[PDB]
A paper describes a structure:
However, exceptionally high-level aminoglycoside-resistance is achieved by the action of intrinsic and acquired 16S ribosomal RNA (rRNA) methyltransferase enzymes in aminoglycoside-producing and human pathogenic bacteria, respectively. CacKam has a SAM-binding core fold comprised of a seven-stranded β-sheet with a central topological switch point, characteristic of Class I methyltransferases.
In contrast to the apo structure of CacKam-W203A, SAM binding allowed the peptide backbone path of the β6/7 linker of one molecule (chain B) to be reliably modeled, albeit with significantly higher B-factors, in a conformation that is partially refolded on the SAM-binding pocket. Interestingly, while the fully disordered linker of chain A is completely unrestrained by crystal packing, the β6/7 linker of chain B is adjacent to a symmetry related molecule. This molecular crowding in the crystal potentially mimics interaction with 30S and contributes to the observed closure of the linker exclusive to chain B. We conclude from these additional structures that cosubstrate binding alone likely does not drive complete reorganization of the β6/7 linker to a structure resembling that of NpmA or KamB. Instead this process must require direct interaction with the 30S substrate.
Numbering used by the authors: 5 to 193, 212 to 227
């Protein structure tokens, strides 16, 4: 099955051979999950034209402004190495399986945020399914989302700190789904951000 990608304002099917040729031509494939307006993904594409930068978000309309920009000629802000895909991470199409050298989840919200905080299987499986073995997962959550008014998707959950990553069982759920936690830290810029890094391996018990 072909991927559903933005070309400017319209959803299209990506030729499976063009997708394959694009991956092989790249020095690294970065999959940015929940890319939002995709401006961060576009910046990365522009700074590393040797990377294939794949932004994944179900809310595809929000990405269209960046897509229009990425599709212009090179001299006018074009980024042909940026591929934006309409999909939710938990139902990620087969053509995205095993592609990524690096998976980033930067300031998620909604299902993606609750999923990573709880370690929901469907979200963590989807994230794992897009990674090559050995790829890093890099998650950043701003801890100010836990100050009032707290958003609905994490209202009922205690604030995620290095200590609760452990005591809620989140490193164990990660391990059961093929993610080995390599590092967690809180970085004070000034909003404090929680960073979690894991590496794609075989599932454990
Ligand atoms: C504001 S954005 C973050 C933008 C970007 N990551 C950044 O640099 O700040 C949060 C995104 O996570 C996305 N999201 C929520 N649930 C998701 C899911 N299940 N799969 C993929 N993305 C999802 C939302 O649609 C939203 O666009």
């Amino acid at each position: 099955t072909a991927l559903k990608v933005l070309a400017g304002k319209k959803l299209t099917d990506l030729d499976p051979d063009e997708w394959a040729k694009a991956q092989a031509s790249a020095e690294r494939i970065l999959v940015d999950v929940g890319t939002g307006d995709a401006r961060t993904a576009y910046r990365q594409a522009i700074a590393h034209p040797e990377w294939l930068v794949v932004g994944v978000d179900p809310a595809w309309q929000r990405m269209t402004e960046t897509a229009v920009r990425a599709a212009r000629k090179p001299a006018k802000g074009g980024a042909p190495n940026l591929v934006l895909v309409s999909s939710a991470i938990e139902t990620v199409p087969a053509a995205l399986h095993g592609v990524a050298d690096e998976v980033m989840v930067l300031m998620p919200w909604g299902k993606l945020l609750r999923g990573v905080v709880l370690g929901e299987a469907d979200v963590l499986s989807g994230l794992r399914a897009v990674a090559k073995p050995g790829a890093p997962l890099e998650i950043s959550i701003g801890t100010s989302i836990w100050r009032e008014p707290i958003p609905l998707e994490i209202r009922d959950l205690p604030e995620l700190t290095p200590e609760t990553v452990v005591s809620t069982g989140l490193t164990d759920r990660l391990a059961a789904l093929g993610w080995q936690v390599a590092d967690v830290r809180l970085v004070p810029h000034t909003e404090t951000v929680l960073h979690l890094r894991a590496v794609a391996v075989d599932p454990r018990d």
